[PDB]
Write a protein that holds these residues in place. Structure first.
Motif, PDB file in Angstrom:
ATOM      1  N   UNK A 136       3.166  13.571  -3.315  1.00 48.22           N
ATOM      2  CA  UNK A 136       2.706  11.920  -3.245  1.00 48.22           C
ATOM      3  C   UNK A 136       1.175  12.254  -3.398  1.00 48.22           C
ATOM      4  N   UNK A 145      -2.364   2.948   7.382  1.00 46.89           N
ATOM      5  CA  UNK A 145      -1.089   2.554   7.459  1.00 46.89           C
ATOM      6  C   UNK A 145      -0.292   3.619   6.546  1.00 46.89           C
ATOM      7  N   UNK A 146      -0.911   4.039   5.559  1.00 45.04           N
ATOM      8  CA  UNK A 146      -0.161   4.965   4.421  1.00 45.04           C
ATOM      9  C   UNK A 146      -0.221   6.463   5.121  1.00 45.04           C
ATOM     10  N   UNK A 193       0.876  -1.128  -0.062  1.00 44.31           N
ATOM     11  CA  UNK A 193      -0.016   0.121  -0.111  1.00 44.31           C
ATOM     12  C   UNK A 193       0.975   1.102   0.142  1.00 44.31           C
ATOM     13  N   UNK A 194       2.180   1.234   0.539  1.00 45.95           N
ATOM     14  CA  UNK A 194       2.946   2.311   0.704  1.00 45.95           C
ATOM     15  C   UNK A 194       3.728   2.647  -0.622  1.00 45.95           C
ATOM     16  N   UNK A 195       3.484   1.873  -1.627  1.00 44.74           N
ATOM     17  CA  UNK A 195       4.141   2.047  -3.170  1.00 44.74           C
ATOM     18  C   UNK A 195       5.596   1.751  -3.157  1.00 44.74           C
ATOM     19  N   UNK A 218       1.213  -4.162   8.386  1.00 39.42           N
ATOM     20  CA  UNK A 218       0.408  -4.272   9.409  1.00 39.42           C
ATOM     21  C   UNK A 218      -0.833  -5.144   9.286  1.00 39.42           C
ATOM     22  N   UNK A 222       9.516  15.621  -2.931  1.00 35.14           N
ATOM     23  CA  UNK A 222       8.826  14.650  -3.802  1.00 35.14           C
ATOM     24  C   UNK A 222       7.373  14.651  -3.297  1.00 35.14           C
ATOM     25  N   UNK A 224       4.907  12.168  -9.465  1.00 34.47           N
ATOM     26  CA  UNK A 224       4.376  12.037  -8.422  1.00 34.47           C
ATOM     27  C   UNK A 224       4.502  10.745  -7.786  1.00 34.47           C
ATOM     28  N   UNK A 225       4.825  10.566  -6.680  1.00 37.90           N
ATOM     29  CA  UNK A 225       5.191   9.307  -5.822  1.00 37.90           C
ATOM     30  C   UNK A 225       3.621   8.853  -5.674  1.00 37.90           C
ATOM     31  N   UNK A 226       3.498   7.510  -5.781  1.00 35.26           N
ATOM     32  CA  UNK A 226       2.393   6.883  -6.042  1.00 35.26           C
ATOM     33  C   UNK A 226       2.092   5.940  -4.808  1.00 35.26           C
ATOM     34  N   UNK A 227       0.713   5.953  -4.226  1.00 37.17           N
ATOM     35  CA  UNK A 227       0.211   4.948  -3.318  1.00 37.17           C
ATOM     36  C   UNK A 227      -0.790   4.627  -3.557  1.00 37.17           C
ATOM     37  N   UNK A 228      -1.581   3.464  -3.023  1.00 41.67           N
ATOM     38  CA  UNK A 228      -2.641   2.627  -3.398  1.00 41.67           C
ATOM     39  C   UNK A 228      -3.232   1.884  -2.338  1.00 41.67           C
ATOM     40  N   UNK A 258      -1.663  -4.081   4.137  1.00 41.81           N
ATOM     41  CA  UNK A 258      -1.503  -2.832   4.677  1.00 41.81           C
ATOM     42  C   UNK A 258      -0.126  -2.657   5.125  1.00 41.81           C
ATOM     43  N   UNK A 259       0.579  -1.551   4.560  1.00 42.03           N
ATOM     44  CA  UNK A 259       2.111  -1.652   4.875  1.00 42.03           C
ATOM     45  C   UNK A 259       2.579  -0.101   4.443  1.00 42.03           C
ATOM     46  N   UNK A 260       3.526   0.303   5.363  1.00 42.18           N
ATOM     47  CA  UNK A 260       4.216   1.683   5.239  1.00 42.18           C
ATOM     48  C   UNK A 260       5.581   1.314   5.361  1.00 42.18           C
ATOM     49  N   UNK A 275      -0.848   7.404   8.122  1.00 43.44           N
ATOM     50  CA  UNK A 275      -0.158   7.637   9.450  1.00 43.44           C
ATOM     51  C   UNK A 275       1.412   7.998   9.149  1.00 43.44           C
ATOM     52  N   UNK A 276       1.901   7.688   8.177  1.00 47.73           N
ATOM     53  CA  UNK A 276       3.405   7.387   7.812  1.00 47.73           C
ATOM     54  C   UNK A 276       3.854   8.504   6.753  1.00 47.73           C
ATOM     55  N   UNK A 277       3.057   8.724   5.684  1.00 52.75           N
ATOM     56  CA  UNK A 277       3.622   9.295   4.425  1.00 52.75           C
ATOM     57  C   UNK A 277       2.778  10.343   4.176  1.00 52.75           C
ATOM     58  N   UNK A 278       3.106  11.600   3.628  1.00 47.09           N
ATOM     59  CA  UNK A 278       2.502  12.899   3.207  1.00 47.09           C
ATOM     60  C   UNK A 278       1.565  12.551   1.905  1.00 47.09           C
ATOM     61  N   UNK A 304       8.576   7.396   7.998  1.00 41.66           N
ATOM     62  CA  UNK A 304       9.567   7.573   9.237  1.00 41.66           C
ATOM     63  C   UNK A 304      10.647   6.349   9.477  1.00 41.66           C
ATOM     64  N   UNK A 317      -7.464  -0.541   6.573  1.00 41.08           N
ATOM     65  CA  UNK A 317      -6.126  -0.453   7.390  1.00 41.08           C
ATOM     66  C   UNK A 317      -5.213   0.138   6.311  1.00 41.08           C
ATOM     67  N   UNK A 318      -5.248   0.007   5.042  1.00 37.45           N
ATOM     68  CA  UNK A 318      -4.422   0.322   4.001  1.00 37.45           C
ATOM     69  C   UNK A 318      -4.145   1.850   4.105  1.00 37.45           C
ATOM     70  N   UNK A 329       6.101   0.646 -11.153  1.00 35.71           N
ATOM     71  CA  UNK A 329       6.872   1.749 -11.191  1.00 35.71           C
ATOM     72  C   UNK A 329       8.289   1.663 -12.164  1.00 35.71           C
TER      73      UNK A 329
END
Lengths: 258, 258
Positions: B3, B64-65, A12-14, A48, B1, B30-34, A41-43, B67-70, A249, B60-61, A23
């Motif tokens: 997001x 998780x993203x 999920x965090x890409x 997680x 970068x 752009x950095x990609x999240x899914x 679910x991941x970062x 809580x950690x990433x912009x 982080x 959850x996905x 990518x």
């Protein structure tokens, strides 16, 4: 337009998984396809939640894309369990999916196991014979062979021993370290070759395994020779590490635009 | 970068869904999240298998993203059912995910419904108020409003009426056709604006809806103004249609490198 398929899990965090695979395909100009084995679910701090997909859904995705679209190369990533592994090998054989870059994804770089022993036996017996190339890390090669890999001589002999499992080629990542460089051992029936790479010191190490194998498969889809493909893939991974964004982080993602 | 996050389904063929969303993010830097809502076996001939993920895994996905990433921008795509829709809106609100481009994904361009009526009610009541922009096609706007949209006057009044549901902006794609051009109606509280686009005649029309909204969200993540973002996204979709690869036997994918 050349096409490459990834058969891997969802990050999920890409930074890893099918996200890092696709990518990488776009960075090399290859059209990207993906058969999902599992969802997480991941970062950058880690996983997680992990949801493994039904083995038949993983087979159906491969059957739907291969029946309709060209596959000039492909790679496999996380496969979850023995049942999914057997289904993937059965699809790859039936549909003739070559060249195939099988990334073992059985032991994490941290040393955490990623696959049950029943899944490892299926991975060696079913999927390895279909692989044109496998890309174990040093700990993964020690698990596949049952032997320690501690010297450059042991690394070269280990990479040759893995050819007995079926793969046409073996890239033993990090099989020998010398100072601030890391040495990969490419073994085929022709012999052994060495690939140097600088040892970057960074938190932004997420997805290094997925990204390398995907870049090899992308270059193979473009028709590059295997030795030139693995060499050019390593240079891209070095640039992606050196220029990685400081996102997250924890273990941050690579810069796939590098 | 910068997001951007997509919350959508998985297209194994790579022409639509999260695959088209991430490929578009990479095209714009752009950095990609899914966050995956569902998995499909799919090709250019259509879907063959659809597996909806548990609503809690979709939550959850996103948790998780975020809580950690912009997250500088985000978009939603296929949402499966009412339960997944409610979970997505609850995450988007809790985590403040703005700007948000909500693509309705309730009626296919072919006229096939894509969402149950209970899911449509949740989509209007829960997710629409959180959307900075929605991108209905003309048939989707007729379903949301309960009114026909047949003239340029009816299209403009329809796009204004949709603002009553909550979204800060409405892009009524294809709300009026004139000869070989197609007119989109952007409605905000400031008023209405028109966006022309040539009507391409091609089989390679797969993923047009996903790709446009993802390009808008990617441009929003870069800080472009909404009017300039929707204009530049349409030019990219026109080039992607004009230069699309002739992959597959049916509705072929767009050329995302265009």
């Amino acid at each position: 337009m050349r096409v490459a398929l990834t058969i891997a899990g969802s990050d999920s965090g890409g930074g890893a998984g099918v996200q890092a695979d696709l990518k990488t395909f776009s960075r090399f100009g290859v059209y990207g396809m993906s058969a999902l084995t599992l969802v997480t679910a991941q970062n950058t701090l880690g996983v997680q939640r992990v949801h493994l997909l039904p083995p038949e859904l993983v087979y159906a995705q491969i059957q739907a894309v291969a029946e309709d679209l060209p596959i000039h190369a492909a790679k496999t990533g996380a496969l979850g369990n023995a049942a999914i592994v057997e289904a993937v090998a059965e699809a790859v054989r039936r549909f003739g999916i070559r060249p195939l870059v099988v990334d073992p994804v059985m032991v994490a770089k941290s040393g955490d196991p990623l696959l049950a022993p029943e899944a490892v036996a299926a991975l060696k017996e079913r999927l390895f014979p279909l692989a044109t190339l496998i890309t174990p890390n040093r700990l993964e090669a020690e698990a596949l062979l049952g032997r320690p890999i501690r010297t450059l001589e042991e690394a070269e002999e280990a990479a040759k021993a893995l050819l007995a499992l079926g793969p046409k080629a073996v890239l033993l990542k990090g099989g020998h370290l010398e100072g601030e460089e890391a040495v990969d051992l490419l073994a085929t029936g022709e012999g052994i070759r060495r690939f140097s790479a600088p040892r970057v010191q960074t938190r932004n190490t997420h997805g290094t395994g997925c990204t390398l194998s995907a870049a090899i498969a992308a270059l193979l889809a473009l028709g590059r020779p295997l030795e030139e493909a693995v060499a050019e893939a390593k240079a891209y991974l070095t640039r992606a590490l050196e220029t990685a964004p400081s996102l997250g982080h924890g273990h941050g993602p690579l810069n796939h635009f590098a």
